[PDB]
Design a protein around this ligand. Structure first.
Ligand SMILES: *[C@@](O)([C@H](CC(C)C)NC(=O)[C@H](CO)NC(=O)CCCCC(C)C)[C@@](C)(O)CO
Ligand SMILES: [Cl-]
Ligand SMILES: [Cl-]
Ligand SMILES: [Cl-]
Ligand SMILES: [Cl-]
Ligand SMILES: [Cl-]
Ligand SMILES: [Cl-]
Ligand SMILES: [Cl-]
Ligand SMILES: [Cl-]
Ligand SMILES: [Cl-]
Ligand SMILES: [Cl-]
Ligand SMILES: [Cl-]
Ligand SMILES: [Cl-]
Ligand SMILES: [Cl-]
Ligand SMILES: [Cl-]
Ligand SMILES: [Cl-]
Ligand SMILES: [Cl-]
Ligand SMILES: [Cl-]
Ligand SMILES: [K+]
Lengths: 239, 230, 220, 248, 237, 244, 234, 233
């Protein structure tokens, strides 16, 4: 059989171990990112698998540098490992070159690390996809997404996980180029509620973060009161 | 890390089949010919050259190792480039110690030894090439072949690649001890014409020669001249 | 040692004396100090003799591997980089002081290379214990764009200045002339010093030396 | 990676080492190679496989190797593997001479190489070397000597022995004709040609098809020589004259 | 470096490589040891005969040091490795303790070498068992046996290799205070034990003795056939 | 023989009975998984690279979707096949070129850079533990003696210089189109190089492009620095073509 | 099947069977319960005894003055992980002269335990932990898994028949934050007791207790010292 | 074939489970802890009258206050025993005190799962140890008996049997054990039980017995002292 190692091509030129790792991401609940006029906003549908867990447990949103947020889907231990790689890369860049890593370069460096795990029988591919978001006055708003193959692209809007396509079709309805982060958080919450399958998985927490002019280029959790207002807007919009 | 186990092993009948299969890659390669004349050696090869789009001058199958030694092959081109690089390095290492150009037979022994390694060492396949190596030293020409096992042989004349069995019998009924280099070049090109298919130009064969003055590729214009008779 | 080089209208002239010393004794009267790098590049050496020989041989060898690969004539910059990076790595412990000259696709180039790994790209240079004598000649007489014969005269004058004024330098003058069209390795160029003749004969006849034991071993 | 490892250094259920046994099948197919010990010397005689018309002839032999001043060997099996081992033999012999300032005794050289072959059957996961060797030599402890080693790293000393094609038949002929304590180089040469004449039964025997080397002592020094073709044809003549006597 | 786990457990607690190593030993030539009162004796079968063999070069009995020797059965190349390792170790002991090894010390060393090759990556077990004999500082005679697992025990007498089962049965019935009262009878007891299983008796028994302080004496075919006749003519009575 | 297989010869890079490397063959199929085709052509004055630019998703920032890469100031490339493999090979090329300049004091020749990448790919065809990269690299640059250069290397470690070449799904069809066009040309050389490249790509795909559906890169003898055309620059070529 | 022997082999469903199998090692361990109030974090563990004459396996381990753990699964993996935790705590006191925050220690476990899940020939850790701690952010209960995931918990139970314990803990968890220590430990014991066969009861031989809080370094109670907590389950 | 660090679907390491099955091929050993000391008793399992019975050593001294009885693949036990000895001497060297029985057992038990073929040194352990161990001794906690198996699980026991007949022997131990039992009673009980479970007729040469007491160091019973205890049994 042709699907047991990342160092084996199938007869049609596929690497099935990388495809299987992608299926782990596609079984995960949905995360979205949206770039707008003055920043980037992340939202995650965080399935609560037990009421015994604390609010906040198993975060899927990370700070990887002071100016860079990361949003993940897939196998969470793999994602955390990648967040640590992203953090080390940002730190090392600052030590060596003396300034904050540009988002695109950070995306490309971590993507090459992901890519290195798709060539060998000695290791397996990462079972995670992740988005990286930043803002600065010089570079503007940037949103990148990286998948288990190590492909990296930039986006206006992005979704990963199991309701990816349904999320993208809602994201396409927004004129995000002309909206502010404060406007977009409500729309992120709205979209998560739309694609959430309330019959099949019973309980979720909405996780929100942002980076933009309004945070002075620092990646930060959306404040509690703004999150609750966005949820309330999303829920009533569902009606 | 690297796989540390051999990928070539003995079969129940005592064969190293990976080496046999490496020889089948050689047998399906483009034809090569070497002829040792009295006063020199000629190496010649067919280009597996489809398109007019190829820049024929951009890569060479006939290559210098030193001022006085050259090589051609049949089989897998990229494997050949490895061996060319190692042969050049082996020749220079010898020169640094002894301050004398490496004797042709010494260079063949060291290159053949590298090929042997790849039949036993961990996590690698053998080379899918056989080499024809020419040189001049001690006032005399040398022609050697080195196979994927690391076995080497000295020849007066031989053929390798596609249709080699026939090419060897063509040379058997045509080579003589007292033959000159210019005549040898002609019979080498005739040997390739036996199995060519395409119409020969100076752009789809490559010829190298070795004599007292050293090893060099013939130029397109020189090959054109030899092709007028053929 | 006195070694020197000049850039002239169409090329490079390199020069060297032929004395090697051990302390204040002449060990070699006819040492060759102008070393092959590639067919278009040569290098004079001063300092520790084993280090100049081995360093130039190694670089020449690595350059031949380079040119075999590229299929092109090597560049003088490439020899310069290779030499200086190796010498820097050894922190001055390799006592090679070099005058590197050649002619490549970008024309003539001349460099001095020091043991610690600094290099200077210049139209005339000198090195060795005779280098200030040779440099005085150059400062007094160099002109840009000299003709071949003028440049050859100037280099041999400069080497001669070192030969006659430095106790470390002596014997013959060797030159190497490099242009786009020609390489003239002139060893010797001049022989300005000659051993005087022997006045008495000391041809000792057989039996002059008393012998305790003898064994003849015949060979094939 | 466990899926692709053919596990060359493990036991089979009957306590066997398959790769060693298979390498021994390779050797059985290679050129016949015999050694014969005499009172005044030792010899090696080998079938040549390099016999095509167009071959060039550049070395002094095909399968006979000088190891040091006092020793030579011949090989049957994979040629490239033989080149590795014979290079290692020469190194071992020079390491000894460096250390002790005397030649390595024959059995000590054989044993040293056999320990390398043994290691390849026990650890490292590599294929063994596909070579058997006959060693001839003189040393000051046991004089003229002949040894045989195989890919298991086993060896033994012999008065006469054969490896390679038709070994079993060759050994029977030696068993019957060899005179313990009474052989000379001249009669060992006759017997070698007799044996090769029967075991190269595809087909008629010729000087182009065999290689003979002798090891003797002359004026306190060891002489190792590869017989010229003139001499080999003369011995073939004498054997053919001798078979004309066989009945009346 | 090759790090494959070669010796592993199977269901039911078997170590198959070790069991297969023991199969190798069982196809080796028979070897026998008896511990006398003030002598120890080793004898071994065959192996091939073969007139054109130089006999000296294939002995299966080996000095480890002045006061310790061994015989083996199984893979002869493997045995040569073990023997040389044990010879090195005997010289370390002398170096650091300034006494010769006890027979138990070097046995324990050989056994733990064997055990390590059943539990280390990249290696197969040694396909040999050994009989190890000699004398301790205080004159006490010793006979130990090791096997591929690394297990070892002391014995009054023992056999390893092919036909060890029946040779051991013979020894169990024939080893008494009477049969080892002297040196000649101890030696004969070993020859009788071999001459049961030994194909074309014999001919191809190799035999060696060690006396208290006296170092290893191997017997020659003339000295062996003296004993053979001296037992064969006694078995008519 | 004829498609025969023994042991693990379809899983790792060991020889099949015919002397094939199936895993290397399969890396060539991987190049086509991307669904894209690239073309490159050289004349006396310039060399050009043209490739398809597919942006199916509206939510992509299309300025980040490219297969054209600067290797050095003077060497450009187009990558075809698996994207992450391609990026890795671009990084390696960049590293090799920079290292060459540091060690030798002059810019790496295009032929040498292509050879080096090919030699690195060769290793993956002989060592069992890693797969080949399922991508193909085409390099362009100006050589001071030989003029504009186009070089291509592949997952087998083969490489060659070309008058023109192609990669990806319609490689074979592009090769025929380019072959037929050069035979007509005197001294077998292309003259209108950007137009040949775009026409070839447009014929073999049957598309008739908008300026946002292709990317174009160039090096010229007068301007050796690798340059990427803008949309408007590309549009001028598309309009000049449309009008004869 | 072809997908279940190597931690490096993804199945076609996007799962890693070796990790799932490692999690079965924890489900078959004896049950343990962890819970917290505003001021204390408690661990309660059932100890399995091989025979009637064996002591009963330790389930609760000291990590630092402010941290202790309860284990389920392979005991040797539990010790290896506990030794790693101890060392990380010692390092933090050595360098910074203050206790390692509990959430940072748990992150270090996640990162350490993830590594062998991605390399050929390595295996997951076959142990699950309940971690009780107290720091500047108050009491904590964390859970760690062989998948290298971890969870921040109001309360938790792992091991055999722990579903029953979890059901009890959900039923009463609105009470925990305001409980005095005695009330909180009683709740832990009642949860653990739900895991038992109907015949059998909590005794001083089979219950082990661990407690840490604002005024109390991590302390283990066994044998006669658990009696105060068991009397008055009234 | 699969790797040595593969979990089964039930959450166990195959290699460890298989090593546990190897313990059942060993001779029976018994340990009993009393307030007056611990005793260790083991079946020798003699396979030929030509074998020297004193060369079978299945009970060993670790230190003056600690003995160890083993069952299973005995050759495997040597490195564990040596590690125990070295550890107690290190502890003495460093701390000038005796190491507890529990601590010794713990140190040895940390070797248990240190096997595998792609983390470790050029020829590290390829498999677990096919050995079970009873450590019996006296420290400031008083007399103590600990059991360890190839999983690296260790635990204190009042009485425990290991090896071929351990079921059987463990049942008789439940029947006869009591917390206030004397050492002399424990010694008799363990010989009575060995006598039942052994295939051979028990005698003074085919068993070994040792004690450790608060007064007295590790003591192997002599032939003559075994004969005395055997009279009643
Ligand atoms: C030169 O620098 C001369 C150059 C050298 C390449 C010949 N250097 C030497 O002669 C040095 C000066 O110490 N001597 C040696 O390295 C000792 C080896 C000489 C003996 C022969 C075997 C070469 C001058 C200016 O130093 C010469 O005086
Ligand atoms: Cl996704
Ligand atoms: Cl490996
Ligand atoms: Cl090269
Ligand atoms: Cl050379
Ligand atoms: Cl050339
Ligand atoms: Cl420079
Ligand atoms: Cl010698
Ligand atoms: Cl010698
Ligand atoms: Cl060892
Ligand atoms: Cl046996
Ligand atoms: Cl640079
Ligand atoms: Cl055109
Ligand atoms: Cl548990
Ligand atoms: Cl366990
Ligand atoms: Cl989990
Ligand atoms: Cl659980
Ligand atoms: Cl048990
Ligand atoms: K490969």
């Amino acid at each position: 059989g042709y699907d047991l190692s990342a160092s084996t091509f199938s007869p049609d030129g596929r690497v099935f171990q990388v495809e299987y790792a992608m299926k782990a991401v596609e079984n995960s609940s949905t995360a979205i990112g949206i770039r707008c006029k003055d920043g980037v906003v992340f939202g995650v549908e965080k399935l609560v698998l037990s009421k015994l867990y604390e609010e906040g447990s198993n975060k899927r949103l990370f700070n990887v540098d002071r100016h860079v947020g990361m949003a993940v889907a897939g196998l969470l231990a793999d994602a955390r490992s990648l967040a640590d790689i992203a953090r080390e890369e940002a730190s090392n860049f600052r030590s060596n070159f003396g300034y904050n890593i540009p988002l695109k370069h950070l995306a490309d460096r971590v993507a090459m690390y992901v890519h290195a795990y798709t060539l060998y029988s000695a290791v397996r591919p990462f079972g995670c996809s992740f988005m990286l978001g930043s803002y600065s006055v010089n570079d503007g708003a940037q949103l990148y997404m990286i998948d288990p193959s190590g492909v990296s692209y930039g986006y206006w809007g992005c979704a990963i996980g199991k309701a990816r396509q349904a999320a993208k079709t809602e994201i396409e309805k927004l004129q995000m180029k002309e909206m502010t982060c404060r406007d977009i958080v409500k729309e992120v919450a709205k979209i998560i509620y739309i694609v959430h399958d309330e019959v099949k998985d019973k309980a979720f927490e909405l996780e929100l973060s942002w980076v933009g002019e309004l945070t002075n280029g620092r990646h930060e959790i959306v404040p509690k009161d703004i999150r609750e207002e966005a949820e309330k807007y999303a829920k009533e919009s569902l009606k | 890390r690297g796989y540390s186990f051999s990928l070539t092993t003995f079969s129940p009948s005592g064969k190293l089949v990976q080496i046999e299969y490496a020889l089948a890659a050689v047998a399906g390669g483009a034809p090569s010919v070497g002829i040792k004349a009295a006063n020199g050696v000629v190496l010649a090869t067919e280009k597996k050259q489809k398109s007019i789009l190829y820049d024929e001058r951009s890569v060479h199958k006939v290559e210098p190792i030193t001022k006085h030694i050259g090589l051609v092959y049949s089989g897998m081109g990229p494997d050949y480039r490895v061996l060319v690089h190692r042969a050049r390095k082996l020749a220079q290492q010898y020169y640094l110690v002894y301050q004398e150009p490496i004797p042709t037979a010494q260079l063949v022994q060291r290159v053949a030894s590298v090929m042997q390694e790849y039949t036993q060492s961990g996590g690698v396949r053998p080379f899918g090439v056989s080499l024809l190596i020419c040189g001049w030293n001690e006032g005399r020409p040398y022609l050697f072949q080195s196979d994927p096992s690391g076995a080497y042989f000295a020849w007066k004349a031989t053929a390798m690649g596609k249709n080699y069995v026939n090419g060897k019998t063509f040379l058997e009924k045509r080579y003589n001890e007292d033959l000159e280099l210019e005549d040898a070049i002609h019979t080498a090109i005739l040997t390739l014409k036996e199995s060519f298919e395409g119409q020969m130009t100076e752009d789809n064969i490559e010829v190298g020669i070795c004599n007292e003055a050293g090893f060099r590729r013939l130029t397109p214009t020189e090959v054109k001249d030899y092709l007028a008779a053929i | 040692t006195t070694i020197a080089g000049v850039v002239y209208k169409d090329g490079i002239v390199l020069g060297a004396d032929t004395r090697a010393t051990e302390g204040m004794v002449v060990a070699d009267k006819n040492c060759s100090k102008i070393h092959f790098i590639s067919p278009n590049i040569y290098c004079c050496g001063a300092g520790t003799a084993a280090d100049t020989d081995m360093t130039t041989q190694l670089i020449s060898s690595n350059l031949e591997l380079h040119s075999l690969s590229t299929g092109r004539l090597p560049r003088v910059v490439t020899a310069n980089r290779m030499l200086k990076q190796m010498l820097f790595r050894y922190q001055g412990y390799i006592g090679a002081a070099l005058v590197l000259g050649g002619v490549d696709v970008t024309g003539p180039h001349l460099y001095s290379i020091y043991p610690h790994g600094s290099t200077d790209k210049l139209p005339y240079v000198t090195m060795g214990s005779g280098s200030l004598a040779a440099m005085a000649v150059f400062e007094d007489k160099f002109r840009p764009d000299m003709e071949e014969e003028e440049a050859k005269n100037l280099v041999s004058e400069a080497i001669a200045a070192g030969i006659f004024n430095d106790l470390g330098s002596g014997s013959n003058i060797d030159l190497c002339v490099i242009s786009k069209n020609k390489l003239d390795f002139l060893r010797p160029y001049t022989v300005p010093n000659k051993k005087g003749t022997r006045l008495g004969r000391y041809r000792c006849e057989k039996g002059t030396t008393a012998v305790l034991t003898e064994k003849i071993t015949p060979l094939e | 990676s466990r899926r692709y490892d053919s596990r060359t250094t493990i036991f089979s259920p009957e306590g066997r080492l398959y790769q060693v046994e298979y390498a021994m099948e390779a050797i059985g197919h290679a050129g016949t190679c015999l050694g014969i010990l005499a009172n005044d010397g030792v010899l090696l005689a080998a079938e040549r496989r390099n016999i095509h018309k167009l071959l060039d002839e550049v070395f002094f032999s095909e399968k006979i190797y000088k190891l040091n001043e006092d020793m030579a060997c011949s090989v049957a099996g994979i040629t490239s593997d033989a080149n590795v081992l014979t290079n290692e033999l020469r190194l071992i012999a020079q390491r000894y001479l460096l250390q002790y300032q005397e030649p390595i005794p024959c059995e000590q050289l054989v044993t040293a190489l056999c320990d390398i072959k043994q290691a390849y059957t026990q650890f490292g996961g590599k294929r063994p070397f596909g070579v058997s060797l006959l060693y001839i030599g003189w040393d000051k402890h046991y004089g003229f000597q002949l040894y045989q080693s195989d890919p298991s790293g086993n060896y033994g000393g012999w008065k006469a022995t054969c490896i390679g094609n038709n070994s079993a038949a060759a050994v029977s002929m030696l068993k019957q004709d060899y005179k313990e304590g009474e052989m000379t180089l001249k009669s060992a040469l006759a017997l070698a040609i007799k044996v090769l004449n029967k075991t190269m039964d595809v087909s008629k025997l010729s000087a182009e098809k065999v290689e003979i080397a002798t090891l003797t002592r002359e004026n306190g020094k060891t002489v190792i020589r590869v017989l010229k073709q003139k001499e080999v044809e003369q011995l073939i003549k004498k054997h053919e004259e001798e078979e004309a006597k066989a009945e009346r | 470096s090759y790090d494959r786990a070669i010796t592993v457990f199977s269901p039911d607690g078997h170590l198959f490589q070790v069991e297969y190593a023991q199969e190798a030993v069982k196809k080796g030539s028979t070897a026998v040891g008896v511990r006398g009162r003030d002598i120890v004796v080793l004898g071994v079968e065959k192996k091939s005969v073969a007139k054109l063999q130089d006999e000296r070069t294939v002995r299966k009995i080996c000095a480890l040091d002045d006061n310790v020797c061994m015989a083996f059965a199984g893979l002869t190349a493997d045995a040569r490795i073990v023997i040389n390792r044990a010879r090195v170790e005997c010289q370390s002991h002398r170096l650091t303790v300034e006494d010769p090894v006890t027979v138990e010390y070097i046995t324990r060393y050989i056994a733990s070498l064997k055990q390590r090759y059943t539990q280390s990556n990249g290696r197969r077990p040694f396909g040999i068992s050994a009989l190890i004999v000699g004398f301790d500082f205080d004159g006490t005679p010793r006979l130990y046996q090791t096997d591929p697992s690394g297990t070892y025990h002391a014995w009054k007498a023992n056999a390893i290799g092919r036909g060890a089962k029946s040779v051991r049965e013979f020894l169990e019935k024939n080893y008494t205070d009477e049969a080892i009262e002297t040196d000649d009878l101890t030696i004969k007891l070993v020859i009788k034990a071999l001459l049961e299983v030994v194909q074309s008796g014999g001919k191809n028994i190799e035999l060696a003795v060690m006396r208290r302080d006296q170092s290893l004496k191997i017997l020659n075919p003339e000295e062996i056939e003296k004993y053979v006749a001296e037992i064969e003519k006694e078995k008519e009575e | 023989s004829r498609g025969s297989s023994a042991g693990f010869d379809r899983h790792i890079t060991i020889f099949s009975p015919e002397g094939r490397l199936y895993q290397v063959e399969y890396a060539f199929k991987a190049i086509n998984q991307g669904g894209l085709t690239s073309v490159a052509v050289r004349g006396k004055d310039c060399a050009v690279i043209v490739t398809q630019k597919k942006v199916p998703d509206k939510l992509l920032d299309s300025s980040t979707v490219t297969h054209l890469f600067k290797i050095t100031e003077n060497i450009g490339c187009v990558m075809t096949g698996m994207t992450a493999d391609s990026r890795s090979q671009v990084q390696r090329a960049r590293y090799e070129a920079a290292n060459w300049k540091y060690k030798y004091g002059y810019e790496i020749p295009v032929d040498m850079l292509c050879k080096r990448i090919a030699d690195i790919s060769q290793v993956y065809t002989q060592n069992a533990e890693m797969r080949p990269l399922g991508c193909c690299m085409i390099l362009i640059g100006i050589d001071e003696e030989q003029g504009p250069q186009v070089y291509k290397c592949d997952p087998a470690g083969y490489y060659c210089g070309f008058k023109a070449t192609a990669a990806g799904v319609k490689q074979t069809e592009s090769t025929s189109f380019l072959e037929k066009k050069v035979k007509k040309k005197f001294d077998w050389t292309f003259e209108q190089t950007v137009e040949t490249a775009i026409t070839c790509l447009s014929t073999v795909l049957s598309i008739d492009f908008k300026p946002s559906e292709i990317e174009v890169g160039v090096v010229t003898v007068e301007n050796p620095k690798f340059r990427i055309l803008t949309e408007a620059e590309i549009d001028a070529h598309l309009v000049a073509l449309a009008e004869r | 099947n072809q997908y279940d022997n190597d931690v490096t082999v993804w199945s076609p469903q996007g799962r890693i069977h070796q990790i799932e199998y490692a999690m079965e090692a924890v489900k078959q361990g004896s049950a343990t319960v962890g819970l917290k109030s505003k001021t204390h974090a408690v661990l309660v563990a059932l100890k399995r005894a091989q025979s009637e004459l064996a002591a009963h396996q330790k389930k609760i381990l000291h990590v630092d003055n402010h941290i202790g753990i309860s284990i389920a699964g392979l005991t040797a993996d539990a010790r290896l992980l506990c030794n790693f935790m101890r060392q990380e705590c010692l390092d933090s006191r050595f360098v910074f002269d203050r206790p390692l925050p509990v959430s940072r220690l748990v992150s270090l476990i996640g990162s350490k335990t993830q590594i062998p899940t991605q390399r050929y020939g390595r295996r997951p850790y076959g142990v699950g932990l309940l971690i009780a701690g107290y720091d500047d952010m108050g009491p904590h209960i964390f859970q760690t898994c062989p998948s290298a995931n971890y969870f921040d918990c109001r309360a938790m139970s792992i091991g055999a028949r722990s579903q029953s314990a979890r059901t009890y803990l959900e039923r009463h968890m609105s009470e925990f934050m305001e409980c005095n220590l005695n009330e909180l430990v009683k709740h832990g014991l009642r949860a653990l007791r739900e895991t038992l066969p109907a015949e059998q009861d909590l005794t001083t031989k089979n219950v082990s207790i661990g407690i840490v809080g604002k005024d109390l370094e991590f302390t283990i109670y066994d044998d006669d010292d658990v009696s105060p907590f068991l009397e008055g389950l009234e | 074939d699969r790797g040595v660090n593969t979990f089964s679907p039930e959450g166990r390491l195959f290699q460890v489970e298989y090593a546990i099955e190897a313990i059942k091929l060993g001779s029976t050993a018994i340990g009993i802890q009393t307030s007056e000391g611990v005793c260790l008793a083991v079946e020798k399992r003699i396979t030929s009258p030509l074998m020297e019975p004193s060369s079978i050593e299945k009970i060993v001294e670790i230190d003056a206050h600690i003995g160890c009885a083993m069952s299973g693949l005995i050759a495997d036990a040597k490195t564990l025993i040596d590690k125990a000895r070295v550890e107690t001497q290190n502890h003495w060297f460093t701390y000038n005190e005796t190491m507890t029985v529990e601590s010794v057992t713990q140190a040895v038990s940390n070797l248990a799962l240190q096997f595998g073929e792609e983390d470790a040194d050029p020829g590290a352990m390829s498999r677990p140890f096919g050995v079970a161990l009873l450590f019996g001794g006296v420290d400031e906690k008083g007399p103590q008996l600990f059991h360890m198996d190839p999983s690296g699980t260790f635990v204190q026991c009042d009485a425990r049997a290991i090896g071929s007949a351990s079921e059987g022997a463990q049942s008789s131990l439940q029947e006869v054990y009591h917390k206030s039992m004397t050492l002399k009673e424990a010694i008799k009980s363990s010989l009575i039980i060995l006598k039942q479970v052994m295939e051979e007729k028990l005698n003074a040469t085919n068993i070994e017995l040792a004690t450790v007491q608060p007064g007295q160091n590790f003591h192997m019973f002599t032939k003559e002292e075994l004969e005395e205890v055997i009279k009643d049994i």
